């Protein structure tokens, strides 16, 4: 999975901004959120979210769902590193295991339960 954010910002600039934001707001985790390719679903105004780390993935679904506003034909799934994170995982734990080398966590969303479908 590829993110547009990674294509628009060079690695060394992401990494330094990531290190800074983790040291300045350690109770949150920096999360890049983008729509998966081929997803037929609503768009999100912003990509960069600072998220309370003790928030579960299920609760993050709630927060993202609200800002998307799902329609009757919709469903909502999260992908991190080609993997649907368990609704029971905390954002902190998810960050721990899956944050990239720029200290950002990258999450894609879709109306299909397979990334890129």
């Amino acid at each position: 999975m590829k993110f547009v954010y990674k294509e628009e910002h060079p690695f060394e600039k992401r990494r330094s901004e990531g290190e800074k934001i983790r040291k300045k707001y350690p109770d949150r985790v920096p999360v890049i959120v983008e729509k998966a390719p081929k997803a037929r679903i609503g768009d999100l105004d912003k990509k960069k979210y600072l998220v309370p780390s003790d928030l579960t993935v299920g609760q993050f679904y709630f927060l993202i769902r609200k800002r998307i506003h799902l329609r009757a034909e919709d469903a909502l799934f999260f992908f991190v590193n080609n993997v649907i994170p368990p609704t029971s995982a905390t954002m902190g734990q998810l960050y721990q295991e899956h944050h990239e080398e720029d200290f950002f966590l990258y999450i894609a969303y879709s109306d299909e339960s397979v990334y890129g479908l």
Binding site: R28, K48, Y49, L50, L55, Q59, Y61, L63, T87
Partner: peptide, 18 residues
């Protein structure tokens, strides 16, 4: 700041919803 945070109200709801 350049980062988006959810409002107080949104997060408190989420602390309940799941």
């Amino acid at each position: 700041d350049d980062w988006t945070e959810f409002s107080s109200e949104e997060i408190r709801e989420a602390r309940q919803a799941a």
